[PDB]
Amino acid sequence: ASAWPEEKNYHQPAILNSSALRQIAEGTSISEMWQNDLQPLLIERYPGSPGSYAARQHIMQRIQRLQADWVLEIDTFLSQTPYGYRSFSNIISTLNPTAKRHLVLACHYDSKYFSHWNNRVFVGATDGAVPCAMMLELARALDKKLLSLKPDLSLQLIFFDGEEAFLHWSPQDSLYGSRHLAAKMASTPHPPGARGTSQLHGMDLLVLLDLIGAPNPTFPNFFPNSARWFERLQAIEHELHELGLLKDHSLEGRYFQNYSYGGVIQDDHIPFLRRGVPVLHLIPSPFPEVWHTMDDNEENLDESTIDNLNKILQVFVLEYLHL
Ligand SMILES: [Zn+2]
């Protein structure tokens, strides 16, 4: 009986040196992400809407243009909702599908439904248009390195649909795409032909981005079984800072702070966490001041902060994948 599902417990990163760090910092472009990945997503895109369809096409097109061998799958399903049965479509983008282990990055691409108010439309810029754009920019920035994957370990990106409640949060009205996908992965043998392991056993770690884009975020270290990875993010941030590779950044105002959070935040990671998947939840606490208001828009985003987080995330992913 192979013990491969236990490999994630001992997996160590291959740390990048100063020269490699400057290379990653220089290889990501916040302006290119802003224009090519983010702005097309700043539209109303609640489940079932025309924008939802456009958001999905944009995400798949941006991934398809890359050199790395991404395999795209649309996970479509029905769920009961406060408005009756509806259709949802999760987007999964995977490198090396049959690879036993995958580091998984995720966000949600739906926007919370709100009827237009005084001509304003809710576009959830930090929630989660920026998280989505950051995952696309990461795929683009690291493309050449990721192409080399073409440790039976690779990368997967999930863009969840229906993360938001159609009304206010309730157990049955929210996390539609993630509750669905988690149950589906839990019941799908992996790798193909496996006798007793599922795709969930193959998830080394689920890195979930949400509510990112506001000034001064503080991410707490939520879970003891991913704490050593939270620490790597802290170390990365510290070294990029010391190397002068971050913008308008101070250690006193660092994003990854030492401190836990006793409570529970409802997000797409819940369905996975409750099935035993290690989670690194990159959601700040407190939430952005614009959370769930018409002001969660482009104008209120903090460009340098998003740029700095792109650098930190990219380094983290390369070091995890030994790239
Ligand atoms: Zn939200």
Question: Any residues with CB less than 8 A from the CB of 100 and at least 6 apart, and which?
Answer: 4, 152, 153, 190, 191, 202
Copy the structure tokens of residue 222. Answer: 């939520």
Phi-psi region of 225 (alpha: psi -120 to 50; beta: other; left: phi over 0): alpha
What is the distance between the alpha carbons of residues 159 and 161, in angstroms, rounded to a whole number?
7
Total domains in the fold of the chain = 1
Copy the structure tokens of residue 203. Answer: 């998830």
What is the distance between the alpha carbons of residues 68 and 146, in angstroms, rounded to a whole number?
6
The SS3 call for residue 277 is coil
Strand order in the sheet with 86-94: 71-79, 86-94, 153-160, 101-108, 203-209, 279-282
What is the distance between the alpha carbons of residues 11 and 100, in angstroms, rounded to a whole number?
14
Task: Give the burial string for 214-240 (b: 16+ CB within 10 Å, else e).
Answer: beebebbbbbeebeebbebbbbbbebb
Helix-strand-coil percent breakdown of the chain, rounded to 5?
35, 15, 45
What is the distance between the alpha carbons of residues 67 and 150, in angstroms, rounded to a whole number?
10
Domain span at 304:
1-323
Q: Is 252 a catalytic residue?
A: no
Q: Is 6 a catalytic residue?
A: no
| CATH code, 67 | 3.40.630.10
Bridge partners of 153, per DSSP, are 101
Say which amino acid occupies 214.
A
Question: Any residues with CB less than 8 A from the CB of 218 and at least 6 apart, and which?
Answer: 255, 257, 284, 285, 286
What is the distance between the alpha carbons of residues 152 and 321, in angstroms, rounded to a whole number?
10
Q: Are 130 and 42 in contact (CB under 8 A)?
A: no
Burial of 43 (0-12, 13-18, 19+ CB in 10 A): middle
Exactly one of 163, 173, 296, 302 is catalytic; name it: 163
What is the distance between the alpha carbons of residues 139 and 14, in angstroms, rounded to a whole number?
19
Query: What end-to-end distance do the CA atoms of the chain give, in Å?
Result: 30
Which phi and psi (to 5°) does residue 94 adopt?
A: -125, 135
Burial of 79 (0-12, 13-18, 19+ CB in 10 A): middle
Which phi and psi (to 5°) does residue 113 adopt?
A: -70, 130
Exactly one of 173, 210, 239, 307 is catalytic; name it: 210
Determine the distance separating the centroid of ligand 1 and the alpha carbon of 44, expressed in angstroms: 13
What is the distance between the alpha carbons of residues 285 and 151, in angstroms, rounded to a whole number?
34
Q: Are 44 and 123 in contact (CB under 8 A)?
A: yes
Element (H, E) at 155: strand 153-160
Q: After which residues is the chain broken (C to N over 2.5 A)?
A: 150
Determine the distance separating the centroid of ligand 1 and the alpha carbon of 125, expressed in angstroms: 10
Determine the distance separating the centroid of ligand 1 and the alpha carbon of 234, expressed in angstroms: 26
Say which amino acid occupies 323.
L
Determine the distance separating the centroid of ligand 1 and the alpha carbon of 241, expressed in angstroms: 30
CB atoms within 10 A of CB 171: 10
